[PDB]
Amino acid sequence: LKSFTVEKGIYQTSNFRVQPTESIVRFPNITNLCPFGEVFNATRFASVYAWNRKRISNCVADYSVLYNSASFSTFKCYGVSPTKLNDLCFTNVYADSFVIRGDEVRQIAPGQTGKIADYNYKLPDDFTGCVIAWNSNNLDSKVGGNYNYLYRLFRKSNLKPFERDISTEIYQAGSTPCNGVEGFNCYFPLQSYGFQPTNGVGYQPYRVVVLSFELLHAPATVCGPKKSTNLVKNKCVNFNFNGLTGTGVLTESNKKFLPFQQFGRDIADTTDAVRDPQTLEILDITPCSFGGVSVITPGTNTSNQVAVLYQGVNCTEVPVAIHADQLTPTWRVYSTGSNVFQTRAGCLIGAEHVNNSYECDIPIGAGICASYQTQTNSPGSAGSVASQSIIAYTMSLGAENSVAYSNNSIAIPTNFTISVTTEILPVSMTKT
Amino acid sequence: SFGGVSVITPGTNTSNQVAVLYQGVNCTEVPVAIHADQLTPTWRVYSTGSNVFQTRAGCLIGAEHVNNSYECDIPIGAGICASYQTQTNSPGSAGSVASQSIIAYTMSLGAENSVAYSNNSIAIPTNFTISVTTEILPVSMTKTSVDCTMYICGDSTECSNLLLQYGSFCTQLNRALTGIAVEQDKNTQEVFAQVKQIYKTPPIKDFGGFNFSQILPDPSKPSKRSFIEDLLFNKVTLADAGFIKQYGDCLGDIAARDLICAQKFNGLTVLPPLLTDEMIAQYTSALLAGTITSGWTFGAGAALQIPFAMQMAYRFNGIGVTQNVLYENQKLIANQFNSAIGKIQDSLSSTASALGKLQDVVNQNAQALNTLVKQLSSNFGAISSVLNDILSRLDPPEAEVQIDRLITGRLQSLQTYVTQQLIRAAEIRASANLAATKMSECVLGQSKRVDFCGKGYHLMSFPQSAPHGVVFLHVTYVPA
Amino acid sequence: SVLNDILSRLDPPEAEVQIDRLITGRLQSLQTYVTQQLIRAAEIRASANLAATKMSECVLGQSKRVDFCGKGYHLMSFPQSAPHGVVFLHVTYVPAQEKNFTTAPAICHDGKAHFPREGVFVSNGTHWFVTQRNFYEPQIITTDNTFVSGNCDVVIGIVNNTVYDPLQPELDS
Amino acid sequence: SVDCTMYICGDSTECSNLLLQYGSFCTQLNRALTGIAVEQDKNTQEVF
């Protein structure tokens, strides 16, 4: 009101709102995981020059295991946060697994040059993806030496990103025709790596897997895992189902959804009942309790005791809305007590319900009216301050009456009154 | 050349064949619009030929003009009206015959009646009729209240901050609707509350033969409400009742099947009316009670019991027909009136359309809210319609600009809603004041104003409660 | 929020954007205000028309409309000035005290029916009187007051009574 | 009577799509004017 004095009436001071208890994040069931195991825990590894490329798509790819696992020496992701993979989703993912020397491991990164980067396996400058590598001295190395892995010494030109060249043909360095065989100025294009268990760290063969994540407009097939929580019902909660979010009280519904259909909809175009991704249950949509708060007070000149009306709410929510149990005992009294009256309009606290009907001083709603009344017994005294209180009652329509209707009688007045009343009407506004 | 197109549909219930109106266009242009060159030859017939009638309003196709004059069912414009009629048909049996079509004709003002005006002749009615008509007026609207913050910002701290920059827009809007809300309560009080004391009818019904039983509240049925009004509640669509909705029952994608619940979601609340329906009936009972037993006196001050038969003697006195008319034909008049009362019951029961005005009151209001609700889906220029996504996807620096667009749109929408709301309320108020005057003058006394109380020298009226409105049963005198 | 600040603060190329924000908003506020006034003005003008009618009907004459001039059979009104409005001091007739009486729409002198020209039939219990509607004054029911219409058979409620004829005493005397 | 579409967007598809983003502002406005349009006729019938 922006005033120190308040005239009697009902005023809307603020808004009542139940706060959310907890946050729920959800994504669909975990099944249909991409086969990471085939790549990482693979029995055999391809060579650097021709590396294995397994496309991963149509799954929920759970990166967490690779990030968390100790087994890998390094795990570096250029384009996106390595932590982010669980949330992020890519249209297509390619895994390039190859075995290369330890010293060379650094080369597997964007914007790099070297034997692998140029000739072997090239990465885009822009490359978005993560490179995971680990040692395989135990697996790959041979005492005799493991020749199986080759890289390329010569080529007509530099290799483009992700371009692999398997070709066995003899490279002709010079003018002399090779004719398929080595000779002067003719060499097999690839050289092997001599890995042996005895060698040093740099020397050790390492299995590296790079997960490129091509991002296109096209539908994204490979998305991250689902970090979900338990479902709680009959409570105002902050829920996040697959696509949407909102706050309300999830309850069991009696709705029969079609097998394919995920969400319902209001006539209005609202989110009404949703199907839980984990359980095939239909849960109907309810905004959490809230309503207006109106203060019913007598004029400040008369008193300062008030009564509050919580519109369109049950009395039950008010003790829960605030943590009454948590609060001090001074605060506790306000939450519940005999002095609570519930009406159609809402829960009115601070006013005692009264059987007697009187004229309506202040309108509450639903026919209930509040007034400040005290019965007073004092000689030559107006109702003085005493144990006064605020009462709410069904507003009296007035003293009820009846007319002695009959076939044969009339009521004709003997005398009358000349009265004067005032009728007031506005004529004009101020000429602004 | 361009103009609006209107479809004259006789009604799907009745027929599929329709007529199309091209407003303010010459008929010559119609074939060019349609791809006559491209389309099949079946289509070719549809564009050209006779069976095209040119009117001031535009070019009308599908309708056959008729010289004969009829009353106007559906207005075309410029006095032309369209209707679906069948020419004489053969007997009803399978046989090949053609009938039923859409006709456009020159609307008839009605049947011309020349009057034999003369030097010294008078027409003096030998017999009369006590008929009854129904007049329906809206009294109040649904006390809608809207929270700006939830509507615009609904649970978004980042949003509300942006709203504050707007200053006082919300406070006034919330204030405006609240002002409207009180006014409705004021409307209902002024309309019904005309009487201080609440009268109840005596156990004896002997009303000179007049049969009130339909109009009086029926002690019995829940709510002491009357029979005729009971149908009235039935004909209308109550928004909701009970004012209690199970929270849990509500939470997901289905509850918005329950529209009110959805409304509950977006800050849209419906305040209840101060005067409850049960309470409203009592007034209607009282206003009715004093009118029956006391005459007009209850408006002036203390109600004075007067036998009903006596009242008509006064009421006839009001029109310029002496008392002798009533008693001399007391039984008939009562019978006429009682039979008259029954007619409303069938008319009311027969067609929903009797209630059309009230229904309108509900419907525009329903429309306003839904339109208000739907706006939430509009992007306006915004990247998306959901507040969370903007926050989620975009950094605040970028987001602030985006949300701002969304804010202006809804705020504009609410602004359109309230402005629209104020005007309709005013429309209602004038009606309410009109309603109050009708109870004040017509019910509480007998009105002198010709064509105020229904066609005829007005006798009296009995109000009946109705949703957000009131129905009057004007009993008028008409010469037979 | 200050125009002079923005002007002092920014060069025109940049300032134009900021000022534009205020103009669209402020104008919109002003637009809001005007719409409110038009609507509100309509309400007042509606009242003015009513006021004029009240002045027209109530002051200038005695209005017949029940509850137009205040509760009761309206006598008259005295308009009074006021700020931005008017106040009327209606003078209304309200019945104060009442007494029950027994009524019947007519009386039979001859076996014929009499109805009251002005008034209704009542009885003190001993004798029948006919009086005006809103203030009790009994009168001796004479032919001068009553008019003929029909006979006793049709009447409903009619009671036997004696009507006084002023003429007889003149001729007999 | 006023169609928003021409009045605003008049034969510009690029314009009209941008209009749709606006939602129901038009359909409501056109509705009101139509409602207004019928109203006068109602007035005339009531009077005469």
XYZ file of N, CA, C and O in Angstrom, chain B residues 131-275:
580
model
N -49.051 -13.942 -22.545
C -47.959 -14.756 -22.991
C -46.802 -14.525 -22.078
O -46.899 -13.763 -21.118
N -45.682 -15.232 -22.337
C -44.484 -15.058 -21.565
C -43.328 -15.257 -22.496
O -43.342 -16.149 -23.343
N -42.271 -14.437 -22.326
C -41.112 -14.510 -23.168
C -39.945 -14.654 -22.239
O -40.102 -14.550 -21.025
N -38.740 -14.931 -22.785
C -37.589 -15.031 -21.939
C -36.560 -14.052 -22.414
O -36.287 -13.952 -23.609
N -35.969 -13.292 -21.471
C -34.924 -12.369 -21.810
C -33.719 -12.794 -21.029
O -33.795 -12.989 -19.817
N -32.565 -12.964 -21.711
C -31.399 -13.427 -21.017
C -30.322 -12.388 -21.127
O -30.033 -11.897 -22.217
N -29.706 -12.030 -19.977
C -28.660 -11.041 -19.937
C -27.514 -11.601 -19.137
O -27.727 -12.374 -18.204
N -26.292 -11.264 -19.483
C -25.184 -11.683 -18.654
C -25.117 -10.801 -17.437
O -25.520 -9.646 -17.549
N -24.826 -11.341 -16.233
C -24.545 -10.516 -15.083
C -23.085 -10.336 -14.757
O -22.610 -9.217 -14.556
N -22.324 -11.454 -14.708
C -20.970 -11.402 -14.218
C -20.119 -12.271 -15.076
O -20.613 -13.063 -15.878
N -18.789 -12.134 -14.916
C -17.877 -12.935 -15.671
C -17.116 -13.783 -14.708
O -17.334 -13.720 -13.499
N -16.220 -14.642 -15.236
C -15.448 -15.491 -14.377
C -14.322 -14.661 -13.853
O -13.550 -14.089 -14.619
N -14.206 -14.607 -12.512
C -13.264 -13.783 -11.807
C -11.888 -14.305 -12.071
O -11.285 -14.934 -11.204
N -11.322 -14.011 -13.253
C -10.026 -14.526 -13.573
C -8.983 -13.641 -12.965
O -9.147 -12.426 -12.879
N -7.874 -14.262 -12.510
C -6.761 -13.550 -11.946
C -5.532 -14.144 -12.562
O -5.470 -15.352 -12.777
N -4.526 -13.303 -12.875
C -3.331 -13.817 -13.481
C -2.138 -13.206 -12.817
O -2.119 -12.014 -12.511
N -1.103 -14.037 -12.581
C 0.123 -13.573 -11.998
C 1.047 -13.327 -13.147
O 1.275 -14.203 -13.977
N 1.573 -12.096 -13.226
C 2.454 -11.666 -14.268
C 3.718 -12.462 -14.191
O 4.177 -13.026 -15.182
N 4.283 -12.574 -12.975
C 5.581 -13.150 -12.801
C 5.600 -14.570 -13.264
O 6.498 -14.973 -13.995
N 4.621 -15.380 -12.839
C 4.609 -16.755 -13.238
C 4.343 -16.843 -14.709
O 4.978 -17.612 -15.429
N 3.396 -16.026 -15.202
C 3.012 -16.099 -16.579
C 4.194 -15.757 -17.433
O 4.520 -16.471 -18.380
N 4.854 -14.616 -17.147
C 5.965 -14.201 -17.956
C 7.235 -14.945 -17.651
O 7.952 -15.386 -18.545
N 7.598 -14.939 -16.359
C 8.793 -15.511 -15.798
C 8.747 -16.893 -15.238
O 9.814 -17.361 -14.879
N 7.568 -17.520 -15.032
C 7.335 -18.795 -14.372
C 8.574 -19.527 -13.917
O 9.200 -20.249 -14.688
N 8.914 -19.376 -12.615
C 10.034 -20.017 -11.970
C 11.328 -19.792 -12.695
O 12.002 -20.756 -13.057
N 11.715 -18.524 -12.949
C 13.001 -18.297 -13.558
C 13.580 -17.062 -12.936
O 13.078 -15.957 -13.142
N 14.674 -17.214 -12.165
C 15.276 -16.081 -11.520
C 15.870 -15.184 -12.559
O 15.776 -13.961 -12.468
N 16.492 -15.780 -13.590
C 17.136 -15.016 -14.614
C 16.101 -14.215 -15.342
O 16.403 -13.144 -15.867
N 14.873 -14.757 -15.470
C 13.800 -14.064 -16.136
C 13.289 -12.880 -15.363
O 13.217 -11.769 -15.886
N 12.967 -13.080 -14.069
C 12.302 -12.077 -13.278
C 13.136 -10.841 -13.222
O 12.612 -9.731 -13.155
N 14.467 -11.000 -13.249
C 15.325 -9.856 -13.167
C 15.046 -8.989 -14.356
O 14.987 -7.766 -14.246
N 14.864 -9.615 -15.534
C 14.624 -8.911 -16.762
C 13.293 -8.225 -16.711
O 13.099 -7.192 -17.347
N 12.318 -8.822 -16.006
C 10.991 -8.282 -15.925
C 10.984 -7.000 -15.138
O 10.227 -6.079 -15.442
N 11.847 -6.896 -14.113
C 11.876 -5.754 -13.234
C 12.201 -4.508 -14.012
O 11.732 -3.421 -13.682
N 13.016 -4.637 -15.075
C 13.462 -3.541 -15.893
C 12.263 -2.862 -16.490
O 12.297 -1.672 -16.796
N 11.186 -3.638 -16.698
C 9.908 -3.233 -17.216
C 9.202 -2.315 -16.277
O 8.195 -1.709 -16.638
N 9.592 -2.298 -14.993
C 8.951 -1.360 -14.127
C 7.638 -1.930 -13.680
O 7.535 -3.105 -13.338
N 6.614 -1.057 -13.650
C 5.296 -1.254 -13.109
C 4.297 -1.954 -14.007
O 3.106 -1.920 -13.703
N 4.685 -2.586 -15.127
C 3.660 -3.147 -15.978
C 2.823 -4.167 -15.245
O 1.594 -4.133 -15.321
N 3.454 -5.106 -14.514
C 2.708 -6.163 -13.882
C 1.762 -5.625 -12.847
O 0.581 -5.965 -12.848
N 2.239 -4.717 -11.974
C 1.445 -4.296 -10.848
C 0.157 -3.724 -11.339
O -0.893 -3.949 -10.741
N 0.203 -2.945 -12.431
C -1.003 -2.371 -12.942
C -1.885 -3.441 -13.516
O -3.098 -3.413 -13.320
N -1.307 -4.416 -14.247
C -2.104 -5.428 -14.890
C -2.814 -6.229 -13.846
O -4.019 -6.466 -13.947
N -2.083 -6.649 -12.800
C -2.665 -7.453 -11.767
C -3.727 -6.640 -11.106
O -4.766 -7.159 -10.705
N -3.464 -5.331 -10.953
C -4.382 -4.417 -10.341
C -5.612 -4.318 -11.194
O -6.731 -4.273 -10.686
N -5.432 -4.274 -12.528
C -6.537 -4.076 -13.420
C -7.510 -5.213 -13.328
O -8.713 -4.995 -13.199
N -7.011 -6.460 -13.372
C -7.870 -7.612 -13.345
C -8.562 -7.674 -12.021
O -9.742 -8.012 -11.945
N -7.840 -7.340 -10.934
C -8.429 -7.405 -9.629
C -9.564 -6.433 -9.572
O -10.601 -6.714 -8.974
N -9.399 -5.260 -10.207
C -10.445 -4.279 -10.206
C -11.637 -4.876 -10.882
O -12.777 -4.631 -10.490
N -11.396 -5.656 -11.951
C -12.464 -6.280 -12.666
C -13.148 -7.252 -11.755
O -14.378 -7.304 -11.708
N -12.367 -8.023 -10.975
C -12.935 -9.074 -10.173
C -13.928 -8.512 -9.201
O -15.043 -9.016 -9.081
N -13.566 -7.422 -8.509
C -14.430 -6.843 -7.520
C -15.676 -6.365 -8.191
O -16.769 -6.455 -7.636
N -15.538 -5.832 -9.417
C -16.665 -5.279 -10.106
C -17.691 -6.349 -10.325
O -18.887 -6.093 -10.193
N -17.261 -7.583 -10.660
C -18.227 -8.622 -10.894
C -19.005 -8.871 -9.639
O -20.224 -9.037 -9.684
N -18.327 -8.895 -8.480
C -19.006 -9.140 -7.241
C -19.971 -8.018 -7.033
O -21.085 -8.221 -6.552
N -19.553 -6.794 -7.396
C -20.395 -5.645 -7.263
C -21.580 -5.834 -8.158
O -22.701 -5.469 -7.808
N -21.363 -6.411 -9.355
C -22.451 -6.577 -10.273
C -23.485 -7.475 -9.662
O -24.666 -7.136 -9.625
N -23.060 -8.633 -9.120
C -23.996 -9.588 -8.599
C -24.732 -9.027 -7.423
O -25.912 -9.314 -7.239
N -24.052 -8.241 -6.572
C -24.733 -7.713 -5.424
C -25.820 -6.786 -5.885
O -26.967 -6.888 -5.460
N -25.495 -5.879 -6.814
C -26.411 -4.871 -7.271
C -27.563 -5.519 -7.969
O -28.697 -5.042 -7.898
N -27.293 -6.571 -8.757
C -28.389 -7.146 -9.472
C -29.354 -7.855 -8.551
O -30.538 -7.519 -8.523
N -28.872 -8.858 -7.780
C -29.696 -9.682 -6.923
C -30.117 -9.073 -5.602
O -31.289 -9.107 -5.236
N -29.156 -8.454 -4.891
C -29.160 -7.958 -3.532
C -30.109 -6.833 -3.282
O -29.938 -6.117 -2.302
N -30.986 -6.512 -4.236
C -31.910 -5.413 -4.157
C -32.743 -5.469 -2.893
O -33.290 -4.442 -2.492
N -32.949 -6.653 -2.273
C -33.800 -6.727 -1.102
C -33.004 -6.976 0.153
O -32.049 -7.753 0.157
N -33.358 -6.268 1.258
C -32.658 -6.418 2.507
C -32.947 -7.735 3.170
O -32.040 -8.521 3.440
N -34.243 -8.018 3.427
C -34.634 -9.191 4.160
C -34.894 -10.292 3.191
O -35.327 -10.055 2.064
N -34.655 -11.543 3.630
C -34.814 -12.663 2.750
C -36.112 -13.323 3.087
O -36.302 -13.853 4.178
N -37.043 -13.301 2.118
C -38.380 -13.798 2.280
C -38.436 -15.244 1.887
O -37.657 -15.712 1.056
N -39.340 -16.001 2.540
C -39.566 -17.386 2.238
C -41.045 -17.554 2.052
O -41.837 -16.893 2.722
N -41.457 -18.462 1.143
C -42.857 -18.633 0.864
C -43.476 -19.478 1.938
O -42.827 -20.321 2.554
N -44.740 -19.238 2.170
C -45.501 -19.977 3.145
C -45.834 -21.330 2.605
O -45.757 -21.530 1.393
N -46.193 -22.241 3.464
C -46.502 -23.580 3.044
C -47.713 -23.663 2.168
O -47.875 -24.684 1.501
N -48.581 -22.634 2.157
C -49.767 -22.709 1.347
C -49.528 -21.962 0.068
O -49.114 -20.804 0.063
N -49.722 -22.683 -1.049
C -49.593 -22.292 -2.426
C -50.745 -21.567 -3.039
O -50.594 -21.188 -4.192
N -51.921 -21.456 -2.377
C -53.132 -20.908 -2.962
C -52.942 -19.550 -3.589
O -53.324 -18.524 -3.031
N -52.416 -19.512 -4.833
C -52.165 -18.247 -5.440
C -53.214 -17.995 -6.467
O -52.915 -17.871 -7.651
N -54.484 -17.927 -6.033
C -55.554 -17.533 -6.901
C -55.631 -18.419 -8.106
O -56.273 -18.050 -9.087
N -55.000 -19.610 -8.069
C -55.071 -20.492 -9.202
C -53.800 -20.412 -9.996
O -53.512 -21.295 -10.802
N -52.995 -19.354 -9.791
C -51.755 -19.225 -10.502
C -50.845 -20.308 -10.007
O -50.736 -20.538 -8.803
N -50.158 -20.996 -10.944
C -49.335 -22.130 -10.616
C -47.880 -21.766 -10.773
O -47.334 -21.757 -11.874
N -47.246 -21.425 -9.638
C -45.883 -21.024 -9.405
C -44.912 -22.164 -9.238
O -43.705 -21.942 -9.275
N -45.404 -23.400 -9.012
C -44.592 -24.505 -8.561
C -43.312 -24.646 -9.329
O -42.303 -25.050 -8.756
N -43.301 -24.346 -10.639
C -42.081 -24.496 -11.383
C -41.043 -23.485 -10.960
O -39.864 -23.816 -10.857
N -41.457 -22.217 -10.756
C -40.591 -21.112 -10.427
C -40.041 -21.139 -9.031
O -38.925 -20.681 -8.814
N -40.812 -21.598 -8.025
C -40.328 -21.583 -6.668
C -39.255 -22.616 -6.504
O -39.211 -23.617 -7.215
N -38.361 -22.367 -5.579
C -37.297 -23.287 -5.268
C -37.927 -24.568 -4.812
O -38.995 -24.526 -4.203
N -37.292 -25.721 -5.094
C -37.885 -26.965 -4.704
C -37.169 -27.484 -3.502
O -36.079 -28.043 -3.625
N -37.729 -27.285 -2.337
C -37.146 -27.842 -1.150
C -37.089 -29.308 -1.418
O -38.152 -29.916 -1.554
N -35.879 -29.892 -1.469
C -35.736 -31.283 -1.782
C -34.363 -31.422 -2.342
O -33.402 -31.747 -1.644
N -34.270 -31.164 -3.657
C -33.067 -31.279 -4.417
C -32.007 -30.512 -3.717
O -32.274 -29.557 -2.994
N -30.803 -30.974 -3.902
C -29.656 -30.364 -3.296
C -29.731 -28.947 -3.763
O -30.041 -28.725 -4.933
N -29.445 -27.979 -2.874
C -29.594 -26.609 -3.230
C -31.066 -26.373 -3.351
O -31.767 -27.081 -4.074
N -31.585 -25.358 -2.634
C -32.988 -25.130 -2.752
C -33.149 -24.247 -3.938
O -33.239 -23.027 -3.828
N -33.218 -24.886 -5.118
C -33.268 -24.217 -6.379
C -34.550 -24.614 -7.032
O -35.184 -25.591 -6.638
N -34.967 -23.835 -8.048
C -36.209 -24.041 -8.735
C -36.029 -25.019 -9.848
O -34.913 -25.394 -10.199
N -37.165 -25.503 -10.393
C -37.136 -26.445 -11.472
C -36.673 -25.805 -12.750
O -35.738 -26.287 -13.388
N -37.284 -24.667 -13.140
C -36.980 -24.087 -14.419
C -35.544 -23.691 -14.470
O -34.875 -23.895 -15.482
N -35.029 -23.106 -13.380
C -33.656 -22.702 -13.353
C -32.763 -23.905 -13.391
O -31.663 -23.845 -13.938
N -33.217 -25.043 -12.831
C -32.380 -26.210 -12.772
C -31.962 -26.563 -14.164
O -30.802 -26.891 -14.406
N -32.889 -26.478 -15.136
C -32.515 -26.796 -16.483
C -31.471 -25.819 -16.922
O -30.529 -26.184 -17.624
N -31.595 -24.550 -16.487
C -30.709 -23.511 -16.934
C -29.291 -23.841 -16.585
O -28.385 -23.621 -17.385
N -29.047 -24.374 -15.377
C -27.706 -24.726 -15.008
C -27.233 -25.830 -15.907
O -26.060 -25.891 -16.268
N -28.140 -26.749 -16.279
C -27.796 -27.904 -17.061
C -27.327 -27.540 -18.447
O -26.417 -28.166 -18.983
N -27.946 -26.527 -19.077
C -27.651 -26.132 -20.431
C -26.282 -25.522 -20.585
O -25.754 -25.484 -21.697
N -25.694 -24.972 -19.504
C -24.447 -24.257 -19.616
C -23.269 -25.114 -19.265
O -23.400 -26.157 -18.627
N -22.067 -24.674 -19.702
C -20.865 -25.408 -19.411
C -20.165 -24.739 -18.263
O -19.589 -23.662 -18.424
N -20.193 -25.377 -17.071
C -19.545 -24.832 -15.908
C -18.080 -25.051 -16.096
O -17.660 -26.121 -16.526
N -17.255 -24.039 -15.767
C -15.850 -24.194 -15.990
C -15.339 -25.309 -15.139
O -14.649 -26.205 -15.623
N -15.691 -25.297 -13.841
C -15.212 -26.305 -12.940
C -16.032 -26.137 -11.700
O -16.770 -25.160 -11.580
N -15.973 -27.115 -10.774
C -16.684 -26.959 -9.537
C -15.981 -27.752 -8.473
O -15.300 -28.738 -8.756
N -16.123 -27.322 -7.203
C -15.560 -28.040 -6.091
C -14.349 -27.319 -5.580
O -14.084 -27.314 -4.376
N -13.578 -26.692 -6.482
C -12.419 -25.926 -6.116
C -11.381 -26.772 -5.444
O -10.506 -26.238 -4.766
N -11.420 -28.109 -5.610
C -10.355 -28.876 -5.026
C -9.866 -29.836 -6.064
O -10.648 -30.607 -6.623
N -8.550 -29.815 -6.361
C -8.017 -30.715 -7.345
C -6.866 -31.427 -6.715
O -6.010 -30.796 -6.096
N -6.818 -32.765 -6.872
C -5.784 -33.545 -6.256
C -4.505 -33.203 -6.921
O -4.358 -33.306 -8.138
N -3.528 -32.789 -6.104
C -2.293 -32.376 -6.660
C -1.737 -33.553 -7.374
O -1.789 -33.547 -8.589
N -1.465 -34.675 -6.684
C -0.701 -35.741 -7.275
C -1.307 -36.212 -8.531
O -0.609 -36.295 -9.546
N -2.649 -36.327 -8.523
C -3.467 -36.880 -9.563
C -3.037 -36.198 -10.778
O -2.991 -36.729 -11.889
N -2.718 -34.941 -10.567
C -2.272 -34.255 -11.650
C -0.987 -34.566 -12.297
O -1.537 -34.661 -13.380
N 0.454 -34.716 -11.903
C 1.983 -34.628 -12.502
C 2.819 -35.491 -13.666
O 3.192 -36.630 -13.400
N 2.941 -34.958 -15.010
C 3.347 -35.366 -16.424
C 2.743 -34.571 -17.731
O 2.526 -33.378 -17.728
N 2.526 -35.205 -18.970
C 1.707 -35.064 -20.292
C 0.029 -35.290 -20.632
O -0.424 -34.596 -21.516
N -0.982 -36.069 -19.914
C -2.495 -36.248 -19.606
C -3.428 -35.302 -18.715
O -4.591 -35.064 -19.007
N -3.000 -34.691 -17.589
C -3.714 -33.814 -16.663
C -4.266 -32.575 -17.285
O -5.193 -31.971 -16.767
N -3.585 -32.052 -18.287
C -3.982 -30.991 -19.130
C -5.062 -31.467 -20.036
O -5.615 -30.744 -20.859
N -5.295 -32.784 -20.016
C -6.529 -33.169 -20.603
C -7.484 -32.405 -19.736
O -8.469 -31.848 -20.214
N -7.185 -32.340 -18.416
C -7.934 -31.512 -17.507
C -7.398 -30.110 -17.659
O -6.350 -29.746 -17.126
N -8.161 -29.268 -18.379
C -7.770 -27.944 -18.776
C -7.561 -27.042 -17.594
O -6.655 -26.211 -17.595
N -8.407 -27.159 -16.558
C -8.287 -26.278 -15.434
C -6.971 -26.511 -14.753
O -6.317 -25.557 -14.333
N -6.562 -27.793 -14.625
C -5.351 -28.154 -13.940
C -4.215 -27.513 -14.670
O -3.318 -26.920 -14.069
N -4.253 -27.575 -16.011
C -3.203 -26.988 -16.785
C -3.159 -25.523 -16.503
O -2.085 -24.933 -16.403
N -4.339 -24.897 -16.373
C -4.408 -23.487 -16.118
C -3.789 -23.240 -14.782
O -3.118 -22.229 -14.567
N -3.995 -24.185 -13.851
C -3.475 -24.068 -12.524
C -1.996 -23.964 -12.671
O -1.334 -23.238 -11.935
N -1.437 -24.685 -13.659
C -0.020 -24.656 -13.849
C 0.532 -23.264 -14.146
O 1.491 -22.849 -13.496
N -0.040 -22.489 -15.107
C 0.619 -21.286 -15.579
C 0.125 -20.024 -14.950
O -0.008 -18.999 -15.622
N -0.108 -20.041 -13.632
C -0.422 -18.831 -12.931
C -1.839 -18.419 -13.160
O -2.277 -17.413 -12.607
N -2.609 -19.182 -13.955
C -3.948 -18.732 -14.202
C -4.804 -19.314 -13.125
O -4.916 -20.533 -12.988
N -5.436 -18.433 -12.322
C -6.246 -18.887 -11.231
C -7.625 -18.355 -11.427
O -7.824 -17.325 -12.070
N -8.626 -19.076 -10.887
C -9.974 -18.608 -10.980
C -10.440 -18.353 -9.587
O -10.545 -19.271 -8.776
N -10.737 -17.083 -9.268
C -11.208 -16.780 -7.952
C -12.646 -17.188 -7.917
O -13.341 -17.120 -8.931
N -13.114 -17.641 -6.785
C -14.495 -18.025 -6.670
C -15.366 -16.820 -6.511
O -14.860 -15.770 -6.116
N -16.628 -16.932 -6.827
C -17.539 -15.833 -6.652
C -17.870 -15.678 -5.203
O -17.974 -16.681 -4.501
N -18.049 -14.428 -4.737
C -18.337 -14.180 -3.354
C -19.679 -14.753 -3.021
O -19.837 -15.393 -1.982
N -20.684 -14.544 -3.899
C -22.000 -15.041 -3.602
C -22.114 -16.393 -4.220
O -22.112 -16.535 -5.442
